[PDB]
Design a protein around this nucleic acid. Sequence first.
RNA 1: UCGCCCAUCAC
RNA 2: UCGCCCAUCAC
RNA 3: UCGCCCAUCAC
RNA 4: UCGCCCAUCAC
Lengths: 366, 366, 121, 121
Amino acid sequence: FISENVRGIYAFDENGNLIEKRYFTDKPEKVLDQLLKGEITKDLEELLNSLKEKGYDEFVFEHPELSRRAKELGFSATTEFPNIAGERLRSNPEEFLGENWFEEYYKVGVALTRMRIQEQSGARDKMVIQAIEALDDVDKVINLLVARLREWYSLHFPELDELLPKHPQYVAFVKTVGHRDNINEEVLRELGLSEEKIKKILEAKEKTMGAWMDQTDIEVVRQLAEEIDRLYQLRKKLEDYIDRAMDDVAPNLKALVGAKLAARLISLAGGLRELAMMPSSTIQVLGAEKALFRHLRTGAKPPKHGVIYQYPAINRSPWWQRGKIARALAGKLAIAARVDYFSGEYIAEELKKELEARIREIKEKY
Amino acid sequence: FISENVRGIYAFDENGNLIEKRYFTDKPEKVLDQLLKGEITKDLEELLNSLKEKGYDEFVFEHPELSRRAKELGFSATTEFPNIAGERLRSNPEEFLGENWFEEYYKVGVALTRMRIQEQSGARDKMVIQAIEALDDVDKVINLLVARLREWYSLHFPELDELLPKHPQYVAFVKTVGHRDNINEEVLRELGLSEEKIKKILEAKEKTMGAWMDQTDIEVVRQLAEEIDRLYQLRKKLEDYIDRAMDDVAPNLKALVGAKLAARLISLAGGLRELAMMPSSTIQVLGAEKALFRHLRTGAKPPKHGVIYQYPAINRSPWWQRGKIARALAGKLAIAARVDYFSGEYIAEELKKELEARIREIKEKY
Amino acid sequence: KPSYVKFEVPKELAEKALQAVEIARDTGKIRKGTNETTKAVERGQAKLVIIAEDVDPEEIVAHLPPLCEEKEIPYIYVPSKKELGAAAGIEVAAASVAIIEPGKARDLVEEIAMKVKELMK
Amino acid sequence: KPSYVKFEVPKELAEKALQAVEIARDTGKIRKGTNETTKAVERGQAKLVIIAEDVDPEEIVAHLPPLCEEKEIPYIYVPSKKELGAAAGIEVAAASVAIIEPGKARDLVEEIAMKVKELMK
RNA sequence: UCGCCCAUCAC
RNA sequence: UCGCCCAUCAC
RNA sequence: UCGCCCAUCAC
RNA sequence: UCGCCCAUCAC
């Protein structure tokens, strides 16, 4: 009844004609992975509710678990993979996407293969900063090797230097030409030069004042141009890395302790400003409640720990370790709360490593 | 320039005249909690875009940290709490809000104050099912005690029972009016009855067939009506709990192992489906990298743990327990994935309590 | 009653599958508990799988029925996990049990498979 | 350059804040380290607070400037956490130090407060 | 030029 | 203890 | 009817 | 050791 592909979502009847079609409201790989692995997304949800407004009460999908979620959503849903909606779209894609269809299938297939692995840094913005310094350093060494490439190739074709000002167009010219008699109207028009620019170059090749480099020499200058086109491809891999890396952003307290303790410390300080304004030797005892109250009013036993008690090394360990870990944890938390309020920048894998190290030190001690 | 209020957000000029004000597009009690603790909201993003498009730049706010989020995001923001916007708006709301402004202050202020406490039960869907049975059992006791109240009071004034059949209105009559010779035209309007109902009842004041209750016989019937009034307040206490707690949703893996580790483990399995299908013995070794390779290909010792080594009770921990904890963690992890994937209910603090009992037993044994 | 069941049954077939565990254990090849059941399920090798009706939380076995469609093997349920553990010879409980080789019980496991293929339909 | 050093410090008064720590050490009432600074910066009447210029992450002391603007107290800084620890008289480091009573340092705190209040203005 | 194992120690 | 796919370096 | 001190075990 | 606010109830 319903089926999905690279560009959209389609409903066909039990005789075999189209009822309705949708396209995705987010980037296609990001929505299609959910629909491929078996879970529901808003664009398929709006289509199947359009079929419910149009008076269809029974539904047939392709994936067994998307069908399982569809009945849990309140629908008479079942699974039959050979059904007409998918059978038509996958048999005659040129009827729906036209005679170029495989190019859009390609563009999302490679992107899904780039997405079906997890991405989690401890230093993502610092890695982006080193990629930004690499982008100026790469452009700066491209400029250096291009200055040598201009001067050395000017021994063999000196008229070229003023004639091709655009640096990557000079690099790709020397990469593919090598020796000056491989210059033809065809290869210059494949390299995408204008008929005007091709009215020169060829005029100069018939009259050049340059010297002679042998076949054995001029391939070294061709290899210099090929390694500069390697550097220009690395330049794009740096730009495309940053274009992904700016999606992995997060708060620190969620990683160092997680919501059960993070939202408790925020609520017992009344707010996240107030938690960031607190000392470790009060963050230790936030949510000690009746124990903090009577340590004041009746001068009772000082509270050893508050709501931090259910931490992964307190409610489950010997008394010797329970007191020492409580204040060390509250120290590292007083750093983490100030980071998440005043700057919002991510360092929490190092705050974890230091709390691994101090608890390993508590282990070699006790 | 900006002033910060409950009846929307406001902008005024250097001379103290209004420019524009806008009303909120999420629940105002949540919009005030953000703006009071100093983070900025969508309706104020729109009001400062309106103020920018009018041709002003000097964006003085009342609050320092709201002004921090504004200039940290990129706006031309400063701070003065006594600025001419707040000095006008809070001096005379009548010029801007309308004369009943205190109703709008009241209805959101009491809601914010009822809302300023955080929530973290361990299995809250079960802890709300018991309140749905409490609503069934509360109407069940009301529909029992009011039958006794009807039968006893109808000894003295039977002309009311078929005339006030809705049980709360009969209880309010027997609580507040009580003895039949108290009945007059004014106290029935102070009870909220209509003229069509007050022609009757007063009809019976001169001619009832009921037999006499004395001054402290009617008292115990009033005590019963005064306690049944509190059972209607208990019905409000349950209605106000159900409207707050029955909208909750939380993932289990996100609480048992923490969000970043859960999200990583889901991808070393290929998906959350696989993490909900696979055995604990395989879930134990997911993403061990070249240690799993040499166990298969080279016939080495099996790895004790994969990516579960990053779990906050394995990563820091001494050798005697690291393997024992990794096995029980892989079982309890396989359960949490099965709950998030097949059921969509929350039990994660129970799953933690059981692994915490097993960790205490590991200390008690080794 | 749990979510994961796909067809209704009386004590019919179910008491015969519990009886098959009581003779496959010492004439054939068997495993007990749900992670060993799941190893023999995922790598296909379980010829018949038996699961309990009273697992608590119920979710720990909820994969075994759809995963037995995905690999094409018969599955059945029985009324109590403690009695399934006792049929598997152990002194605790078992949420599931897996038959790798029926031993003497081949005609009996083939009856169970042939009559469960009347219900998986 | 960290976000908390919000005014440019000259070749004067910085050494006078270092000296104010040195002579309060045995004669006033004083706290050292940033969490003890934080509680004596909230509670009772602090007189002056001192920070290092090399605190890293800067976020741990980045709270001290806005916390001084809410409560009408002056702050100042000195070139190193290791020198600020040595000024307090401990052989580790200190990110900050707080004065509760100046002892000998009372005329130094009065000169620093007068000169900084008209610098930042 | 490269690899393994027993006892003891640690997270 | 063994199988296949696969990069890279080499004869 | 209730509290306090000291010695001691498990986590 | 010493105070301040709080609900609900008494001799």
